[PDB]
């Protein structure tokens, strides 16, 4: 029961520094163990940050030192990443995570992590497009249709689907960056017999712009 | 630093198998070796610490052994849940440090893709753009070719691709892909082709649209 997530911003200007907030509950940060920032680069390549001690004792990875700072707030049992001076190599997936201090120094919790993004780029809504087949494309036993989320940032996006019929199968498919914009798209497969008969449409959300968009398929 | 190196990246094993991930470290770190389980939406979970010992909860299929610079994973009795990728840490000095990972995939019956072509909206056209997209959905093996063809021709430029992960159910893979052109070169061709090249067949599986119809 015991439980970490990390928030803060999602993206982050380069020079300007990051700060990340860990929340834990069901267990309190004074009472023993060491309190770890992690992150993992484009790549999968995990990298220990550093940690706040339950007794308030401090330690970095030597390759960070210079632009980080750990802290801690009781009160809240709260714990604290600013990361300063940051560039585009330090966009990456940013953990929090509870490890013994010392002895066999394992990570027993983790958070599930957070996404940040080091770019100048503007935070711009997605453009939603309605993906039904052609007309002189007559089908058989079920349909596919889609949606097409072109030309936003930052990442991410969500996609639902309501159509009628719980034989739904979704893809979601993820994202690729054309020119400085993020693309993806979703599919949806339902029987012959629900579609054009029962409306079919698409949701997108876009928190960092928190917009959100529904098209209806149109045969 | 201690330097972790997981020399397999790559696995791919049956269901009820027995799988071996290796970890190796720079230096000699006395059994103070743990293992981590990654799921590809990201969430963490910590399997065996110092060599051998289970985590709470961990399944006994799990296990682990080693000694000085040498260690290894080895998951017997292999199940649909464990597609993930496994990392080593060694837990002996500051900094913590972690191998590059193991993915896992789990084996499955062959799968040809079924196949959809959508031409652009009407939507998208007012906006001077048009792409022309492709499913290829629900395939195994991952491995698989697209070519499109504008007017019988191919086209190698504009084109984006993107695999799901390995569904965590039923093991296939799914693939869209997207052709991105001006309306102008979009309004300037008929025949728009989508052809899927996959181990389950063969020929090609085709699918196009012509705008004169
Ligand atoms: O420098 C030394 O040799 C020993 C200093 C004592 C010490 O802090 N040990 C120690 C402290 C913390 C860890 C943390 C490991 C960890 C592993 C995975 C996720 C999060 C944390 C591992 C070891």
């Known amino acids: 029961e015991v439980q970490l997530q990390e928030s803060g911003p999602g993206l982050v200007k380069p020079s300007q520094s990051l700060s990340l907030t860990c929340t834990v509950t069901?267990?309190?940060?004074?009472?023993?163990?060491?309190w770890n920032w992690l992150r993992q680069l484009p790549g999968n390549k995990l990298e220990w940050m550093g940690y706040?001690?339950?007794?308030?004792?401090?330690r970095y990875n030597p390759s960070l030192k210079r632009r980080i700072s750990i802290t801690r707030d009781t009160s809240k049992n709260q714990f604290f990443l600013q990361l300063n001076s940051v560039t585009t190599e330090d966009t990456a997936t940013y953990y929090c995570?509870?490890?013994?201090?010392?002895?066999?120094?394992?990570?027993?919790?983790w958070g599930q992590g957070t996404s940040v993004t080091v770019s100048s780029a503007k935070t711009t809504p997605p453009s939603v497009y309605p993906l039904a087949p052609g007309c002189g494309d007559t089908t058989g036993s079920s349909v596919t249709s889609g949606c097409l989320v072109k030309g936003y940032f930052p990442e991410s996006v969500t996609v639902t689907w309501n159509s009628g019929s719980l034989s739904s199968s979704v893809h979601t498919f993820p994202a690729l960056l054309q020119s400085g914009l993020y693309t993806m798209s979703s599919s949806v497969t339902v029987p012959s017999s629900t579609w054009p008969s029962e409306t079919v449409t698409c949701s997108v959300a876009h928190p960092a712009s928190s917009t959100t968009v529904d098209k209806k398929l149109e045969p | 630093d201690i330097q972790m190196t997981q020399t397999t990246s790559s696995l791919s094993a049956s269901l009820g198998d027995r799988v071996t991930i290796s970890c190796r470290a720079s230096?000699?770190?006395?059994?103070?070796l743990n293992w981590y389980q990654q799921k590809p939406d990201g969430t963490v979970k910590l399997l065996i610490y110092?060599?051998?010992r289970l985590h709470s909860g961990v399944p006994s299929r799990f296990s682990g052994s080693g000694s000085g610079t040498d260690y290894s994973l080895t998951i017997s009795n292999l199940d649909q849940d464990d597609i993930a990728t496994y990392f080593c840490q060694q837990g002996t000095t500051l900094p913590p440090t972690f191998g590059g990972g193991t993915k896992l995939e789990i084996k499955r019956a062959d799968a040809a893709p079924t196949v959809s072509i959508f031409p652009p909206s009407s939507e998208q056209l007012t906006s001077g753009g048009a792409s022309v997209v492709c499913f290829l959905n629900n395939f195994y093996p991952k491995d698989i070719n697209v070519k499109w063809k504008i007017d019988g021709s191919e086209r190698q430029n504009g084109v984006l691709n993107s695999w799901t992960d390995q569904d965590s159910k039923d093991s296939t893979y799914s693939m869209s892909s997207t052709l991105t052109l001006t309306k102008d070169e979009y309004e300037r061709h008929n025949s728009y082709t989508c052809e899927a090249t996959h181990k389950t067949s063969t020929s090609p599986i085709v699918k196009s649209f012509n705008r004169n119809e």
């Open positions: 706040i001690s339950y007794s308030g004792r401090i």
């Open positions: 230096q000699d770190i006395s059994n103070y």
């Open positions: 069901g267990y309190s940060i004074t009472s023993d163990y060491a």
């Open positions: 110092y060599t051998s």
């Open positions: 995570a509870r490890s013994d201090y010392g002895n066999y120094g394992r990570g027993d919790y």
